[PDB]
Design an enzyme around this catalytic site. Structure first.
Site, PDB file in Angstrom:
ATOM      1  CE1 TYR A 137      -3.128  -3.029   2.010  1.00  0.00           C
ATOM      2  CE2 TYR A 137      -3.597  -2.412  -0.241  1.00  0.00           C
ATOM      3  CZ  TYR A 137      -3.813  -3.231   0.822  1.00  0.00           C
ATOM      4  OH  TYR A 137      -4.714  -4.267   0.717  1.00  0.00           O
ATOM      5  CG  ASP A 392       9.455  14.241 -12.011  1.00  0.00           C
ATOM      6  OD1 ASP A 392       9.985  13.551 -11.112  1.00  0.00           O
ATOM      7  OD2 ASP A 392       8.566  13.797 -12.787  1.00  0.00           O
ATOM      8  CD  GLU A 445       3.458  15.447  -8.879  1.00  0.00           C
ATOM      9  OE1 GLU A 445       4.571  15.475  -9.494  1.00  0.00           O
ATOM     10  OE2 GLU A 445       3.244  14.647  -7.965  1.00  0.00           O
TER      11      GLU A 445
HETATM   12 MG    MG Z   1       4.134  11.273 -10.442  1.00  0.00          MG
END
Ligand code: MG
Ligand code: MG
EC number: 3.2.1.58
Length: 548
Positions: A137, A392, A445
């Site tokens: 998880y 990124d 993002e």
């Molecule tokens: Mg990501």
């Protein structure tokens, strides 16, 4: 130009009598499991039939699909699995893969598809539960399900957000930050902010992605007709409306194909089938013929050289672009993808152009640069699953090194985006200038690498919205939209808002959120100068239910 022909060595075709299917798929996976930026590409294709004792583990740049007209025609007593073992349980980099047109009877009763972006799950019949989370998880950043039936429960667990459309589920376990549904039978009730469920009864318009299949011994591409106010699967009550195109009506694109040849093929009346591979072009691929299908297999990738645009669709009805990654070259391209001409004003409501499973990357596999990644000029265009991503991490990444100012710019009227994922652009990730736009599900993002507050100063605003509706717009509506920040280069940076829009009766948003990842930067507001700032380092969303 001749149509038809062999699909090549990167399309691996199996039938139930194929020896050692498991060993074959396992060898692809051994090579692709952690191969995040490599140039290899694979399509695994299964002829109609029943396959036993199979666990098809899907790595990077691997598509898997059945070849029946209907999903149940190709059944695994077994699984189509994505997990996060290679990244110690963190599923946030499980990108660029796909599953389509299969029925699964998972061995333990639950199939795991623990993916992040650009990992579509389409036209699937899961005869059991579907677990979207990695074992343990850990973090996960998906995801996209369309036209699928999951007999049991879909369990997102630690998935941060998710979009499902035009599907049926036996149950839905939980929401984390943003679970959005349109046209989903069995979807949980609208409940945002808690649980964070955004639930729409129908999808305003959808048209299922075309796919390769076998009619007897002949390859064809099935081209689904559009549905208005769609709900549930297209194939549940038998074969849906649509047309089948024989493979000989396609130019089968392989290594060596120039834009000039591809463009000549379209002008001559051929559709395009991109076999899995990486295709450099020295001028744009131009699709100026109505109803042209341009379908990619195995994450087929186009790289524009010398700063050219990779793909231009003309001002015509019914173009269907699907399953392509456009990867920026090191020389800046003013645009990577243009849908319609600047100033296009034609009506395409009855038969729109669509982009589906079209992904864009700037940097990561080497330096890449583009000013605006996708410009949508044509009215009525459908964008159904896109991930437009300024890298990124990886090679060739930096505030200037892989500068990409703008992600998607929508100029056409009546454009619909369903499952919109856009991340890390130096300026506005999405800008919407056309009238009557609709977005159902947005994930963003903000760029991590802004060096200081000045670098993102936007007039008298701190930062550029992740999603900007131009102030001249009269009518716009968005549902289920989130923007997250991680200013790790300079955590003192403040982002004024995730969203910016005019204040007008016909410009509405439902279920907005912003989130700071671990306190690296903060948002001052959610939309405009409205809503509470994020604070602390515990990654708790700030939400707005209704705007205005
Ligand atoms: Mg990501
Ligand atoms: Mg216009």
């Amino acid at each position: 130009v001749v149509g038809g022909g062999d699909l090549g060595p990167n399309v691996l075709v199996f039938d139930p009598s194929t020896p050692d299917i498991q060993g074959k798929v396992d060898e692809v996976f051994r090579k692709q499991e952690s191969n995040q930026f490599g140039t290899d590409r694979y399509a695994l294709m299964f002829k109609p039939g029943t396959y036993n004792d199979i666990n098809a583990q899907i790595g990077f740049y691997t598509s898997i699909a059945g070849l029946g007209l209907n999903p149940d025609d190709t059944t695994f007593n077994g699984d189509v699995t994505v997990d996060a073992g290679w990244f110690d349980g963190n599923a946030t980099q499980n990108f660029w893969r796909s599953a389509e047109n299969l029925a699964l009877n998972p061995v333990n009763g639950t199939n795991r598809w623990a993916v992040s972006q650009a990992a579509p799950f389409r036209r699937m019949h899961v005869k059991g539960g579907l677990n979207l989370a990695p074992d343990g998880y850990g973090w996960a950043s998906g995801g996209y399900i369309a036209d699928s039936k999951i007999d049991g429960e879909v369990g997102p667990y630690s998935q941060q957000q998710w979009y499902t459309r035009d599907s049926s589920v036996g149950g839905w376990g939980n929401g984390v930050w943003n679970m959005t549904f349109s046209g989903v039978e069995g979807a949980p009730a609208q409940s945002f902010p808690e649980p964070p469920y955004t639930t729409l009864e129908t999808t305003p318009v959808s048209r299922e992605k075309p796919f390769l299949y076998l009619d007897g011994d002949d390859y064809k591409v099935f081209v689904p007709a559009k549905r208005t106010n769609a709900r549930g699967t297209s194939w549940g009550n038998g074969t849906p409306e649509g047309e089948s195109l024989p493979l000989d009506q396609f130019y089968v694109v392989k290594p060596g194909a120039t834009a000039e040849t591809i463009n000549a093929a379209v002008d001559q009346g051929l559709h395009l089938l991109f076999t899995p591979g990486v295709y450099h072009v020295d001028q744009p691929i131009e699709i100026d013929r109505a109803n042209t299908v341009a379908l990619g297999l195995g994450l087929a990738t186009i790289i524009p050289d010398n700063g050219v645009t990779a793909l231009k669709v003309g001002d015509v009805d019914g173009v269907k672009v699907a399953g392509l990654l456009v990867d920026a070259g090191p020389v800046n391209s003013e645009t990577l993808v243009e849908v319609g001409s600047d100033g296009a004003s034609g009506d395409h409501a009855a038969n729109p152009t669509s982009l589906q499973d079209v992904f864009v990357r700037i940097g990561g596999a080497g330096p890449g640069k583009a000013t605006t990644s996708i410009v949508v000029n044509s009215n009525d265009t459908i964008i159904d699953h896109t991930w437009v991503w300024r890298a990124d991490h990886g090679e060739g990444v930096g505030w200037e090194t892989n500068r990409a100012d703008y992600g998607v710019h929508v100029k056409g009227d009546n454009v619909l985006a369903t499952g919109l994922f856009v991340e890390h652009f130096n300026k506005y990730d999405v800008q919407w200038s056309g009238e009557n736009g609709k977005t159902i599900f947005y994930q963003n993002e903000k760029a991590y690498d802004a060096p200081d507050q000045a670098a993102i100063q936007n007039g008298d605003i701190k930062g550029y919205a992740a999603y900007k509706v131009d102030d001249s717009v009269t009518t716009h509506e968005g549902w289920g939209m989130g923007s997250y920040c991680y200013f790790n280069v300079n955590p003192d940076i403040r982002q004024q808002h995730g969203f910016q829009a005019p204040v007008k009766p016909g410009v509405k948003f439902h279920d907005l959120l912003v989130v700071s990842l671990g306190g690296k930067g903060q948002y001052e507001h959610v939309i405009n100068d409205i809503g509470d700032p994020t604070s602390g380092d515990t990654t708790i969303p700030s939400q707005v239910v209704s705007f205005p």
